[PDB]
Amino acid sequence: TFNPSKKLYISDVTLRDGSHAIRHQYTLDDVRAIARALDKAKVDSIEVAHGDGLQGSSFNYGFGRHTDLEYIEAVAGEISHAQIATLLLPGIGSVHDLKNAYQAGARVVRVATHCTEADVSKQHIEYARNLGMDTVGFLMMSHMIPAEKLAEQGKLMESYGATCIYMADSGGAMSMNDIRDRMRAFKAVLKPETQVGMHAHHNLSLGVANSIVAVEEGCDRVDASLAGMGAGAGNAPLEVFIAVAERLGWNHGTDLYTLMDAADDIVRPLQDRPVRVDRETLGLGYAGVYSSFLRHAEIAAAKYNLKTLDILVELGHRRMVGGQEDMIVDVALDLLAAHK
Amino acid sequence: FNPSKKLYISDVTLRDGSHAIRHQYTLDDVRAIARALDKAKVDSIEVAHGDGLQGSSFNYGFGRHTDLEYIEAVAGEISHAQIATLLLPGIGSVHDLKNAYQAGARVVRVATHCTEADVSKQHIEYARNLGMDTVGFLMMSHMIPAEKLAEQGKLMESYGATCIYMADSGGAMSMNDIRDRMRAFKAVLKPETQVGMHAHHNLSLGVANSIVAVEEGCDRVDASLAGMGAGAGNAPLEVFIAVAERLGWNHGTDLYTLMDAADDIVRPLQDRPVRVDRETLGLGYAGVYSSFLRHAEIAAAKYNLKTLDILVELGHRRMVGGQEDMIVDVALDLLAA
Amino acid sequence: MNQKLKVAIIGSGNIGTDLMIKVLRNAKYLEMGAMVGIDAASDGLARAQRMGVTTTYAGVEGLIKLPEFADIDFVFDATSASAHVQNEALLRQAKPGIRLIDLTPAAIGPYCVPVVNLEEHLGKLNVNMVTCGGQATIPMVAAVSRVAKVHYAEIVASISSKSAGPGTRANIDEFTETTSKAIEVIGGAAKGKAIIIMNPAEPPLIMRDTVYVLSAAADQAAVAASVAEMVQAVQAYVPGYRLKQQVQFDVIPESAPLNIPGLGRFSGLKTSVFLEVEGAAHYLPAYAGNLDIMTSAALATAERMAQSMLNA
Amino acid sequence: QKLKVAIIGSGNIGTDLMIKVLRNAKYLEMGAMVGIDAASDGLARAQRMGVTTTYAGVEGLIKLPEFADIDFVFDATSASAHVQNEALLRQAKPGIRLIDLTPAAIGPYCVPVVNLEEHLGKLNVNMVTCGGQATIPMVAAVSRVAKVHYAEIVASISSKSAGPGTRANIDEFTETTSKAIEVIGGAAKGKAIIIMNPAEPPLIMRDTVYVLSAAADQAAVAASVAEMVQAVQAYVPGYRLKQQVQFDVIPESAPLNIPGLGRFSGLKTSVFLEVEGAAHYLPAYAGNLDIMTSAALATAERMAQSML
Numbered sequence A: 001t002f003n004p005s006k007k008l009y010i011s012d013v014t015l016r017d018g019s020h021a022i023r024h025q026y027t028l029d030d031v032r033a034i035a036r037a038l039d040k041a042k043v044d045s046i047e048v049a050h051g052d053g054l055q056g057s058s059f060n061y062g063f064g065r066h067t068d069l070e071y072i073e074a075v076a077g078e079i080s081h082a083q084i085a086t087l088l089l090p091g092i093g094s095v096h097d098l099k100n101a102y103q104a105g106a107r108v109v110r111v112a113t114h115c116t117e118a119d120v121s122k123q124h125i126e127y128a129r130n131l132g133m134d135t136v137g138f139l140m141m142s143h144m145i146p147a148e149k150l151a152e153q154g155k156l157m158e159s160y161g162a163t164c165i166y167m168a169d170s171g172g173a174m175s176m177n178d179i180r181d182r183m184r185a186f187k188a189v190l191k192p193e194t195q196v197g198m199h200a201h202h203n204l205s206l207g208v209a210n211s212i213v214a215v216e217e218g219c220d221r222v223d224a225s226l227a228g229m230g231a232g233a234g235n236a237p238l239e240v241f242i243a244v245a246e247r248l249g250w251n252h253g254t255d256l257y258t259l260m261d262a263a264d265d266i267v268r269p270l271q272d273r274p275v276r277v278d279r280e281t282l283g284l285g286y287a288g289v290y291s292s293f294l295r296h297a298e299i300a301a302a303k304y305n306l307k308t309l310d311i312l313v314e315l316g317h318r319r320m321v322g323g324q325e326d327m328i329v330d331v332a333l334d335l336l337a338a339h340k
Numbered sequence B: 001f002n003p004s005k006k007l008y009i010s011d012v013t014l015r016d017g018s019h020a021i022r023h024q025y026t027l028d029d030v031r032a033i034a035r036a037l038d039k040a041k042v043d044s045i046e047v048a049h050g051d052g053l054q055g056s057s058f059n060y061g062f063g064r065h066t067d068l069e070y071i072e073a074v075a076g077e078i079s080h081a082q083i084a085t086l087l088l089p090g091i092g093s094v095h096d097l098k099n100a101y102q103a104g105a106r107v108v109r110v111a112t113h114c115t116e117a118d119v120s121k122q123h124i125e126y127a128r129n130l131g132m133d134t135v136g137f138l139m140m141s142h143m144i145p146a147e148k149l150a151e152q153g154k155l156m157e158s159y160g161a162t163c164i165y166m167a168d169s170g171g172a173m174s175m176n177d178i179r180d181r182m183r184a185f186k187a188v189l190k191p192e193t194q195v196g197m198h199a200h201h202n203l204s205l206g207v208a209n210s211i212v213a214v215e216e217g218c219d220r221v222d223a224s225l226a227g228m229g230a231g232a233g234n235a236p237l238e239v240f241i242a243v244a245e246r247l248g249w250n251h252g253t254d255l256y257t258l259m260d261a262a263d264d265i266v267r268p269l270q271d272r273p274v275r276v277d278r279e280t281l282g283l284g285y286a287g288v289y290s291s292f293l294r295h296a297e298i299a300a301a302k303y304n305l306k307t308l309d310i311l312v313e314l315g316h317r318r319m320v321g322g323q324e325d326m327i328v329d330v331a332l333d334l335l336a337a
Numbered sequence C: 001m002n003q004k005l006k007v008a009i010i011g012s013g014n015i016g017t018d019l020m021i022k023v024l025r026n027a028k029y030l031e032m033g034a035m036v037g038i039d040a041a042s043d044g045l046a047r048a049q050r051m052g053v054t055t056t057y058a059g060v061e062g063l064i065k066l067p068e069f070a071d072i073d074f075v076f077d078a079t080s081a082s083a084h085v086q087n088e089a090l091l092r093q094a095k096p097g098i099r100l101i102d103l104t105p106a107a108i109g110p111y112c113v114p115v116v117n118l119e120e121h122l123g124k125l126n127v128n129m130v131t132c133g134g135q136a137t138i139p140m141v142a143a144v145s146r147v148a149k150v151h152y153a154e155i156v157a158s159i160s161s162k163s164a165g166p167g168t169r170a171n172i173d174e175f176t177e178t179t180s181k182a183i184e185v186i187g188g189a190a191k192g193k194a195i196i197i198m199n200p201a202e203p204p205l206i207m208r209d210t211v212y213v214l215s216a217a218a219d220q221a222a223v224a225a226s227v228a229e230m231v232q233a234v235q236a237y238v239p240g241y242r243l244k245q246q247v248q249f250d251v252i253p254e255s256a257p258l259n260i261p262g263l264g265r266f267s268g269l270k271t272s273v274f275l276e277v278e279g280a281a282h283y284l285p286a287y288a289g290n291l292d293i294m295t296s297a298a299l300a301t302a303e304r305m306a307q308s309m310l311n312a
Numbered sequence D: 001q002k003l004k005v006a007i008i009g010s011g012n013i014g015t016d017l018m019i020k021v022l023r024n025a026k027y028l029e030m031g032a033m034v035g036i037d038a039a040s041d042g043l044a045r046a047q048r049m050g051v052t053t054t055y056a057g058v059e060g061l062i063k064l065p066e067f068a069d070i071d072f073v074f075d076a077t078s079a080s081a082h083v084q085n086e087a088l089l090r091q092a093k094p095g096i097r098l099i100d101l102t103p104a105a106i107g108p109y110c111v112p113v114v115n116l117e118e119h120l121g122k123l124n125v126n127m128v129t130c131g132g133q134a135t136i137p138m139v140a141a142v143s144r145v146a147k148v149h150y151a152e153i154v155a156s157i158s159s160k161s162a163g164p165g166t167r168a169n170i171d172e173f174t175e176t177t178s179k180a181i182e183v184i185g186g187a188a189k190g191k192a193i194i195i196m197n198p199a200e201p202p203l204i205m206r207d208t209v210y211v212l213s214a215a216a217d218q219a220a221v222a223a224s225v226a227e228m229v230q231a232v233q234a235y236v237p238g239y240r241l242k243q244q245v246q247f248d249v250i251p252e253s254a255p256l257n258i259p260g261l262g263r264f265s266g267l268k269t270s271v272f273l274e275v276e277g278a279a280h281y282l283p284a285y286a287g288n289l290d291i292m293t294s295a296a297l298a299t300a301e302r303m304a305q306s307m308l
């Protein structure tokens, strides 16, 4: 059976998930420089928004240096190959924010919910489909429920109109067989035409390994970022994933050297807290803690004179979900009281 | 594979990690690291220059101390783990092995390029005559097919090695390459012969490849604190142990002790960060011997070339372990062009 | 007292059923007239029946036809923001002077947060109760705004997934929008923001609300004492509402202002209030203080409206 | 007229040497090729050239009738085999001249461009190793210009050019080459490394020489190096620099620490050689055979010239 090879969809999240690593301080020159490189490299999409999605700028998650719409408009002016993607979390961003982001240039939207809460995505997915956007469902903290339950939530977003479903390993807690389990569950219940995306985090050093396995199990889209720029120990490092994909003979359609150069020449120098696996980010992956909590826990650790790892371990015990950064100070205050 | 099977954890922070610090560990550095590893209950602690016994040289870089001085310092601090060492025929000799055993080494890994196992015969025989735990170690294991690699492993077993490692010295293999090689080894070695994995992290697969090797029946895992080691480093020990622990594997070590040692003792000793970046990714993409990294960076700075251009041409030349001198040869040829 | 006015509750779900139990047990000027649902198998209707309350599963057109409707003067809407529009429409035509108390975020009538403005809209025939997050956090915003000018106020409400029924899950955008607007209008903040998060953890989590208030420079002791007075005031309605932590403060110098993109470059004081809200466990268990903070507010508003009409 | 010789060891070195004796020797002529493996290719090459062979080792050599007139034995077996070969040959023919191509080194070292004339009267002369014959001339080229504190050589050869006899004497290779770098090259301390690479098409022999000397004039070192390359080319035309001599000044303010040897400043000279062979047995890449066998032959030839 002689058939055309599968073309992988490469979704860069350097300007959205990577916003967490720089505490949402990208300049307009930064986003233009990064988008130009990515677009030259021929990635399929460039995701742009605050790390917590549209209207994530806040005291809870940190304020952005610019608004999401300013960043989107800046990127739209520099690119001609890739589409602009954005992230929207019901409870934080709204359909009105999605309308404004579409007006600014976004054409792909990933509507993200905690893995058990996909029914809050209905109106956003239906609105995005009415706008003619590439509409994607995105399930956060995907290690928290079994593969068949996650698939049922994915099928619910499919029923709302999403044409792609992602699993996001927000806590960077999964290993390769957990990825296999989830990909098989999705493929068993979704329509054959519905795309599947992988969004791995690197907290256990398996961001690229998990992406490779996702693709071997049939996934269509892979989220990654230059130098892994992203929450916790970062996302799967895009230049690394593409180097491996290239050695495997996979049809990824991007330019490897452009990505390798952009990662170290443009993106890496913007880091002020190195995006790597270390005691703290390994603690996120081990405990299965939402990766964006990293810097907020390091800030609380320095303010209250505690160890960041002790804060993360307790957050793991508390079973917090995405968006619950206010519980980081709660845990820190409780640890101080406990120690007294 | 059974998760209750006890894994053998072999730390290489004081041997492969020597490459990351350009062989400048102080004696207090090696005592502090060894003390933490011993407290963590790792099975062995490997001590030597990066290029093994008598690696100190112009080609690989001179040590701050000799191998025997480091071994003696480490011996004085530990009580649980054994001291392992590395010996490459063509660089170190049986004489050097004898001295290392007298200083305290009990495990010797005799390393050859993957197609040259027959040069290890005398070293393996000598190690078995001292009653050491004698291990064959095949470098650059991505360079030949699994069946051919297993044939070389069988040769070392035949000389007397009781454990055979595959080392992904270029950090070029992905997970299925590890399965292929594990299956080939298990098909031809005696059932009692131990198998070991020595992954490098140049493609970010140091831990992933180690996990797959264990799923495929490997007995020993080499790793190092913070990945301290050539290239983008070895499999990072604290990360491998965290994953093994989450999987319910019997790794037999203390994770917390390792995590603190990696960042409070080892990571602060790095000058050039041990990480996956353009240059170390280049090693894995091109399949180049990982210890070439800092020597290529040195040559790049001297001749004003991009390190990556030097590493990609080295990959085309198909160099093996120990060929640091060809790094300058390539730099000069790139400037000639 | 003895002479009470009758009420209907439309929505036999988490909020409506907790509100019915509060009317039954604690109302002094009001008494149950009918519980109205659209699902004959609804647990709330079964509960209403066991407690002797008249029920209908024929919606608001069904309520308008009960014999009891002639004597119902108040209607509490605990359905969903979209359904309130039609509910108001129908009830208003059937009985022009009926009082609607909206527990959804539709907000077709003005906002009421009792500890801040209970007396303000007592003559209005449609009053909106904001949201659970609003009722829990607007008092803390007002507590700061009565000490110092507030530039920006942000609330984060986290509730157990099991306590948020379908009605809540169909109006999440309206939750953020109505709550933000009410933080400005009632709380006194120049700009408001509201976030809602559901967490399905087991045992179910107690509602938590965190309020971040950016004001001009102010005396920290005065802000803390004002917060404490306001917590005491809300506790007269909901006893399990309490600080989980002492009020936290961060001074923001004019030499190093905080940039809120497109809003301003601010200096002064950041006040952080960490609340937890334990409910009375009338319907769901005590962790669901998110029901109570709304239902006690809605009942207090209608009770005061009734008091005013029965005793000028 | 020409004196008869035996070569013991019919491998890569021994067979290459045989071809050179046949074609180039002026004072010597082949008498026998001696091995221990009847299937050895070198014994088959020898038979094709009309040379008497035996697969019965040194013992067989002596029983050979040809042995009565054999005045020179070249030993191309392996270092442990050589002490026994010397023993049995000395007993049987006291004045026989042994030219040791193995790293056994029981006789003094000879690197022709440095000391051909020195040991012409000795009955057992050792030819160091291929790495030593390629690189000792460079160490010596630096030492005649400045004091050498340390010298290190890295020899990389194709795996196909390294027979089993080479592989069984790798330790001896590093020890004898390092001692010869000192004794003949003039370095106060030597080190030698040997690497085998199986790449295909097989690789040309490469040799890198690093020399730490006292401060010196770079043009003078480079000129000395060039003269020595020319000297070696008189024997092995494919011996040459692959790169210009490279230099690094080691300042007195940041000396190099060689652990247990000392702290030194001065000049680091790096010489990058390549050695193409004449393709007498293996192809031209195997210059590691020629650098040894031409040296061995030049030594015995000079001895035979003087015997007369």
Ligand SMILES: NC(=O)c1ccc[n+]([C@@H]2O[C@H](COP(=O)([O-])OP(=O)(O)OC[C@H]3O[C@@H](n4cnc5c(N)ncnc54)[C@H](O)[C@@H]3O)[C@@H](O)[C@H]2O)c1
Pocket (backbone or CB within 6 Å): C010, C011, C012, C013, C014, C015, C016, C036, C037, C038, C039, C042, C044, C059, C060, C078, C079, C080, C081, C083, C103, C104, C105, C131, C132, C159, C163, C164, C165, C166, C167, C168, C169, C171, C290, C291, C294
């Ligand atoms: N913590 C909370 O759950 C919370 C707190 C405050 C305010 N609210 C608001 O209260 C409202 C109800 O929330 P909920 O959690 O109780 O939802 P729910 O789904 O549990 O309850 C809604 C009820 O309304 C019924 N219903 C729907 N349409 C109806 C109609 N036309 N007539 C009669 N009944 C009808 C449903 O069958 C159900 O019984 C929502 O607008 C929500 O935003 C919820």
Ligand SMILES: NC(=O)c1ccc[n+]([C@@H]2O[C@H](COP(=O)([O-])OP(=O)(O)OC[C@H]3O[C@@H](n4cnc5c(N)ncnc54)[C@H](O)[C@@H]3O)[C@@H](O)[C@H]2O)c1
Pocket (backbone or CB within 6 Å): D008, D009, D010, D011, D012, D013, D014, D034, D035, D036, D037, D040, D042, D057, D058, D076, D077, D078, D079, D081, D101, D102, D103, D129, D130, D131, D157, D161, D162, D163, D164, D165, D166, D167, D169, D173, D288, D289, D292
């Ligand atoms: N580049 C090189 O390969 C090289 C260069 C210089 C010097 N040398 C030295 O030359 C020697 C031969 O190396 P090689 O590569 O030609 O090895 P080889 O295995 O190709 O040759 C050795 C020959 O000696 C024979 N032999 C072994 N033991 C014998 C014995 N006791 N009596 C008679 N014959 C015996 C073997 O059968 C074989 O024919 C080694 O000592 C090596 O160190 C090798």
Ligand SMILES: O=C([O-])C(=O)[O-]
Pocket (backbone or CB within 6 Å): A017, A112, A140, A141, A168, A169, A170, A171, A199, A322
């Ligand atoms: O949204 C995120 O990016 C995720 O959950 O990891």
Ligand SMILES: O=C([O-])C(=O)[O-]
Pocket (backbone or CB within 6 Å): B016, B111, B138, B139, B140, B167, B168, B169, B170, B198, B321
């Ligand atoms: O020796 C090792 O360290 C290698 O080969 O990877």
Ligand SMILES: [Mn+2]
Pocket (backbone or CB within 6 Å): A017, A168, A170, A199, A201, A230, A231, A235
């Ligand atoms: Mn993410």
Ligand SMILES: [Mn+2]
Pocket (backbone or CB within 6 Å): B016, B167, B169, B198, B200, B229, B230
């Ligand atoms: Mn290694």
